[PDB]
Design a protein around this ligand. Structure first.
Ligand SMILES: NC(=O)c1ccc[n+]([C@@H]2O[C@H](COP(=O)([O-])OP(=O)(O)OC[C@H]3O[C@@H](n4cnc5c(N)ncnc54)[C@H](OP(=O)(O)O)[C@@H]3O)[C@@H](O)[C@H]2O)c1
Ligand SMILES: NC(=O)c1ccc[n+]([C@@H]2O[C@H](COP(=O)([O-])OP(=O)(O)OC[C@H]3O[C@@H](n4cnc5c(N)ncnc54)[C@H](OP(=O)(O)O)[C@@H]3O)[C@@H](O)[C@H]2O)c1
Ligand SMILES: NC(=O)c1ccc[n+]([C@@H]2O[C@H](COP(=O)([O-])OP(=O)(O)OC[C@H]3O[C@@H](n4cnc5c(N)ncnc54)[C@H](OP(=O)(O)O)[C@@H]3O)[C@@H](O)[C@H]2O)c1
Ligand SMILES: NC(=O)c1ccc[n+]([C@@H]2O[C@H](COP(=O)([O-])OP(=O)(O)OC[C@H]3O[C@@H](n4cnc5c(N)ncnc54)[C@H](OP(=O)(O)O)[C@@H]3O)[C@@H](O)[C@H]2O)c1
Ligand SMILES: C[C@H](NC1=NC(=O)[C@@](C)(C(F)(F)F)S1)c1ccccc1F
Ligand SMILES: C[C@H](NC1=NC(=O)[C@@](C)(C(F)(F)F)S1)c1ccccc1F
Ligand SMILES: C[C@H](NC1=NC(=O)[C@@](C)(C(F)(F)F)S1)c1ccccc1F
Ligand SMILES: C[C@H](NC1=NC(=O)[C@@](C)(C(F)(F)F)S1)c1ccccc1F
Lengths: 263, 262, 254, 254
């Protein structure tokens, strides 16, 4: 069955990194469809604006909780506070990333580590905190990832490590869930260049290729999440999105799906 | 890569670090390297097992053989280990990154400690060891060998934390190889993708759960070294040597080639 | 955009070639049970009468046979004209016959190569050409039976494999021609592994069931699928797909 | 790795050598100092003389139509006599073709199959004793259309696909029977040949590679005893043509 805006009507959603970029755009779509949303990011000032607009858009309710996802206590506590405020949770959209520039890896281990903590580890912590509420609603988890979390790109090594780790972690637990019969879907989003302020300021110097619109991106993420799709692909090039599928991975996974015996 | 056949003489007098070399694949690499007449420095936590590896290496024919014991959970050890290892041999030609944190098969529930420890031991420390070794490797136009798994190319249930860390290795080191191509760094990076190998540890952890043909650790070890010496980008090793034909990704090579002009 | 149910063949007008034995005979039986009109062909006149009588028994709307050799292109063309006359049209053309073949090393057997190409490939084109007006009348379907050896190289089946490869290239090309020209005739290529037919079991390895093979060919044809895969091993069937070929056709489409 | 030394003094046949890629192959072989025999249906005399100007060890022609299988078998015996043996058989000729939707042109399908495929098998059968003696090479020229479906070239595509099925199957027969003759299938994208440019202008919107390098890459591949040789304008494309799932399935080499 196709996508219909009424799927999100009165759904309780969390969106992280929702103060700008694709995250903000997702908050607004959900707002228009009349969902309950809790947005988060570090900056209370920009979050206050996302919230007022979400209200003007017709969100069933909108609120923010500010803090840094470098802090795993905040991450864990935020999900509880969000869930209690809404009276449950049907969808968790994991979107935030730590600030990153294009540069050749030098000696910047602290940045590799910060990338792994914010972009990967916090997502695991947020998922654990949310799973009980999601099991209750038979809800879904949306993980926002990149082309560089599927293939190798220079200039983004710390950031690619962390997005590859997302695919590794979440694709493994999706298999775990389907045998444990946990009715929580996990959707991985693989995005090419998207025209967000920070992306444009980060890349527009070095490389360049055509950036897709953030507003359509955001909407395509929500729909893959709504339709319990395993992977969402989104780029300006149709070539790229055809090429990003990995049929041989799919083959190996079925091949090996028999050679274990679990209960 | 080098357009030529592997010959053991390629490693004679070469200066090599092997991590997690107290047992399993790591120990067999040290032995192979010793038989070939390389200088070897091995590491792991177990002082006592490391001493035994060193003794066999010396009588096997190593130009020289030493060990330094410590935990790769400690990023200060990792960084110092490499400095100390390069002092022992007078430089470094190959760095083989092989160790991993003790892990066993389990459904993920809420062990964030374990996910964290995995990322630190199986991923972060490899970055730290690589930063420390790069100067020495540049002086010798040498090689980095990163040992990985099937579960670092495809999803596999029960190894979620481990798989996260091995995927991250592909992502990090594959990106650095691109960067080494742009900036003209003559240090090869070989990522090894292994199926089930019959190591003590693996055999106990998967017994009764997975039902697969385990391949021989001795041959596995040699293929890794050969891969490294021939400066291959990837090495594939599995008992079912046809499976290794799937795991290569031409769409990925194409997108990497395609975006190479942006 | 659907799933299969036997009732899709009820009242359909279906030609089955190579229907005197093996898979083709099973296909005719399946179609009879589904209540189709069936015109069967093969060389064996006396065997075909027996196939026809049992098809009636089973519930075919009607059943007829016409005997002849598909080495004769004039027979191929006349057969289709007469099959259409007996049925009042045509909904599905199942092209299944092959010439007699053994596993053998290739030395100097040009005559076997040519004959393979004639019977296994060229007769399929002639029958298609003759059937096309009617299949256009009906928005019908062409079902081409092929082989693993028509996708990949196998020693000892060189002439057979040349003819099965040729089928893929010929019917896959016109299939794209029918898209662009908006001809609503589907083309199904069935790629099959070892099947437990009397002929194959002697000539030759895990053999899949012929009865179940026959139904799967019909299903793909009925659902208007581009390719159908059938082997005793699920592993083999996963691998027969070629995503890369799909990309390149997707590519060159512009 | 390849060096022009490799072909100095080698006895080579080039078919369809009176125009385009074929002609260029003779020239390269001439600048390499090879014995060439070239064939086609006059212009061969022009080609044979220019081969001498470029310093071929010898340069001869035999004119005929590869529609005639008697000619084909005779031409090779003749050519083998003239050079006293054969090292490389380069099969390059094709029948004249146009871009066109297939409708009811069975004669063209038949002609294509005879000239483009059956003749290549006739030439190989006649060449096999000599190529065995000299541990030689067979080089088959094929196309994108011989690996993927492509509208407008159905007949051609069938014949090219048939070359792949046939020659890759015997390649594997040669290995298991330890016959030390190599087989090189060349898969070419669009080349800026005089027939191809006239045939596809205004219809295929594609970048054409040059005649010169194509011939050389063809020659190198066969000199180097490579299984397949891809050549197209697109650096892009050529990573997708390789089919690992085919490789894997063939590894029911058992
Ligand atoms: N844009 C692209 O070209 C593109 C391409 C591929 C993938 N993606 C993916 O899409 C997602 C969104 O990217 P985007 O370009 O929209 O991002 P963006 O505009 O930079 O927004 C990032 C959001 O995350 C927040 N954030 C930064 N540090 C944080 C921290 N320590 N704790 C909590 N939140 C933090 C930011 O707000 P604060 O600073 O106030 O905390 C901001 O709200 C990312 O996951 C990215 O990987 C984007
Ligand atoms: N065996 C397989 O089936 C298989 C399959 C796919 C990939 N691989 C890869 O191949 C490589 C070797 O695996 P294996 O099976 O040989 O493993 P193993 O036998 O368990 O060896 C692991 C090594 O790492 C050391 N180690 C553990 N914790 C450490 C720490 N904190 N700091 C430093 N060293 C530590 C161990 O010694 P101590 O405890 O004494 O420190 C031992 O020397 C790994 O990278 C693995 O991911 C193996
Ligand atoms: N069996 C397998 O393992 C297998 C595997 C892969 C693909 N396939 C494909 O499946 C199809 C059926 O194979 P099968 O195993 O069922 O073969 P089969 O039992 O030998 O039947 C072949 C049919 O073709 C007919 N035939 C033979 N020569 C003919 C001619 N010159 N003119 C007209 N009809 C002729 C035969 O009947 P008459 O003698 O009465 O004329 C018979 O009815 C074939 O297209 C084959 O390539 C089969
Ligand atoms: N050019 C491309 O864009 C392209 C693309 C894909 C594949 N290819 C392959 O490259 C090879 C050569 O192509 P090309 O473009 O060079 O073709 P071409 O320029 O037209 O040359 C074809 C040759 O075949 C000869 N020929 C034609 N009919 C013949 C017959 N009945 N008997 C014997 N010889 C005959 C012609 O000489 P006469 O007319 O004097 O007899 C001519 O010498 C072919 O196998 C083709 O499939 C080419
Ligand atoms: C958020 C963004 N992510 C990207 N993800 C990707 O795969 C890149 C390379 C692009 F989208 F292809 F451009 S950019 C990014 C990551 C790292 C540095 C800058 C930057 F804009
Ligand atoms: C070291 C081993 N690595 C593996 N990597 C893999 O891909 C596994 C699943 C196997 F090889 F496919 F079996 S096992 C392993 C990882 C995690 C737990 C046990 C264990 F033995
Ligand atoms: C009809 C059959 N076709 C086959 N096609 C195939 O791909 C073969 C090799 C098999 F199915 F893989 F076994 S068998 C066949 C072809 C040639 C000789 C015998 C014979 F049984
Ligand atoms: C010789 C050429 N062969 C080709 N082979 C191919 O695969 C084509 C479609 C091209 F190479 F893709 F352009 S063209 C050709 C074949 C048939 C008709 C015209 C014509 F130019």
């Amino acid at each position: 069955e196709e996508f219909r805006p009424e799927m999100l009507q009165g759904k309780k959603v969390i969106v992280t990194g929702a103060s700008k970029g694709i995250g903000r755009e997702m908050a607004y779509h959900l707002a228009k469809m009349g969902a309950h949303v809790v947005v988060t990011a570090r900056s209370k000032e920009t979050l206050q604006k996302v919230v007022s607009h979400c209200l003007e858009l017709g969100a069933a309710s909108a609120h923010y909780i500010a803090g840094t996802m470098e802090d795993m206590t905040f991450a864990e506590q935020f999900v509880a506070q969000a869930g209690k405020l809404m009276g449950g949770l049907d969808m968790l959209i994991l979107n935030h990333i730590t600030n990153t520039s294009l540069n050749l890896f030098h000696d910047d281990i602290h940045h590799v580590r910060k990338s792994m903590e914010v972009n990967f580890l916090s997502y695991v912590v947020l998922t654990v905190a949310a799973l009980p509420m999601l099991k209750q609603s038979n809800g879904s988890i949306v993980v926002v990832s990149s082309l560089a979390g599927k293939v190798a790109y220079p200039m983004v090594a710390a950031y690619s490590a962390s997005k590859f780790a997302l695919d590794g972690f979440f694709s493994s637990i999706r298999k775990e869930y389907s045998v444990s019969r946990v009715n929580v879907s996990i959707t991985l989003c693989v995005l090419g260049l998207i025209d967000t302020e920070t992306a444009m300021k980060a890349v527009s110097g070095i490389v360049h290729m055509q950036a897709a619109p953030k507003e359509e991106c955001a909407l395509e993420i929500i729909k893959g999440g709504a339709l319990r799709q395993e992977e969402v692909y989104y780029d300006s090039s149709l070539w790229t999105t055809l090429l990003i599928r990995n049929p041989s991975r799919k083959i190996l996974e079925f091949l090996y799906s028999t050679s274990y015996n679990m209960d």
